[PDB]
Amino acid sequence: WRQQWSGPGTTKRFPETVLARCVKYTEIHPEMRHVDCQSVWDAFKGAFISKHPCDITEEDYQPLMKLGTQTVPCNKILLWSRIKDLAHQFTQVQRDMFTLEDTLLGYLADDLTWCGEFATSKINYQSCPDWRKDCSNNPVSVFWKTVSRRFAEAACDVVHVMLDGSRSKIFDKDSTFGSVEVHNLQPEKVQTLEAWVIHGSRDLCQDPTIKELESIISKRNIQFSCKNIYRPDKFLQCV
Numbered sequence: 205w206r207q208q209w210s211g212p213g214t215t216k217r218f219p220e221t222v223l224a225r226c227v228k229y230t231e232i233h234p235e236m237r238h239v240d241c242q243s244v245w246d247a248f249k250g251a252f253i254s255k256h257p258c259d260i261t262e263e264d265y266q267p268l269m270k271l272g273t274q275t276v277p278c279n280k281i282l283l284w285s286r287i288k289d290l291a292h293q294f295t296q297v298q299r300d301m302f303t304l305e306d307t308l309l310g311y312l313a314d315d316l317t318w319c320g321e322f323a324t325s326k327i328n329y330q331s332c333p334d335w336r337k338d339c340s341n342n343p344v345s346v347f348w349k350t351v352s353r354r355f356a357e358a359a360c361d362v363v364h365v366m367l368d369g370s371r372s373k374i375f376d377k378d379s380t381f382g383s384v385e386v387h388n389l390q391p392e393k394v395q396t397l398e399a400w401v402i403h404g405s406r407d408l409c410q411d412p413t414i415k416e417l418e419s420i421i422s423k424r425n426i427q428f429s430c431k432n433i434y435r436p437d438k439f440l441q442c443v
């Protein structure tokens with residue numbers, strides 16, 4: 205008998221991949237040059253192997269968190285929601301700005317799936333828990349929750365956030381941003397959350413869910429700002 209989850213399994217070559225990503229990142233970001241990637245992988249693995257893939261906690265990821273400590277300039281943070289492809293394109297241009305995935309820990313896991321199983325050191329390449337159908341506390345979900353929190357707490361000055369203007373929910377309170385990030389911005393260091401709405405011809409800052417974002421933020425004594433981005437590709441140049 206082998207247990208079958210609703211979600212897709214661990215990505216093939218996942219151990220080999222994460223390790224290789226760590227080696228590459230260290231090579232190209234000179235300040236990380238002396239990070240031990242085998243120790244980093246071992247701490248990643250350590251967080252989820254031999255554990256039921258539904259009893260994962262944030263503490264499990266702390267050994268890895270500590271190894272992948274990176275405090276980027278907090279005034280240079282770019283958050284995003286659902287519209288990740290464009291946000292990375294952006295930081296591949298501006299290049300002083302940072303999304304989570306341009307940090308080591310996020311770079312290591314972006315687009316990847318992993319999970320283990322109780323009591324053995326094996327990795328499940330056949331399936332992993334679905335956040336909806338099976339478990340909210342899986343290894344992937346707990347990973348992003350944990351780093352999303354630390355990332356957003358770090359932030360300062362003006363934090364900019366990208367949102368998708370073709371979605372029915374421009375701001376989703378149940379997304380990683382609406383659920384974890386927004387609530388961890390510190391009023392001490394963050395003055396403004398500036399929202400960018402990307403039109404994938406009318407003013408989408410008026411939107412109800414944007415107005416709802418304005419409420420969450422306003423109640424943290426942080427100022428809110430919203431700008432339409434009519435022609436997206438034109439923004440990429442005019443930066």
Ligand SMILES: Cc1cc(NCc2c(Cl)ccc(Cl)c2Cl)c2cc(F)cc(C(N)=O)c2n1
Pocket residue numbers: 288304305313314315316344345346348349352378379380383384
């Ligand atoms: C696969 C994945 C999942 C991410 N977060 C899931 C999620 C949602 Cl949608 C809502 C609430 C919570 Cl607490 C959680 Cl954990 C996720 C989040 C990111 F910020 C980034 C990625 C990514 N780059 O792959 C991500 N991926």
Ligand SMILES: *[C@H]1O[C@H](COP(=O)(O)O)[C@@H](O)[C@H]1O
Pocket residue numbers: 282283284285286287303304352355379380381382385
């Ligand atoms: C933290 O979470 C957002 C992306 O998650 P969504 O579920 O909101 O797309 C990203 O900006 C990270 O900084």
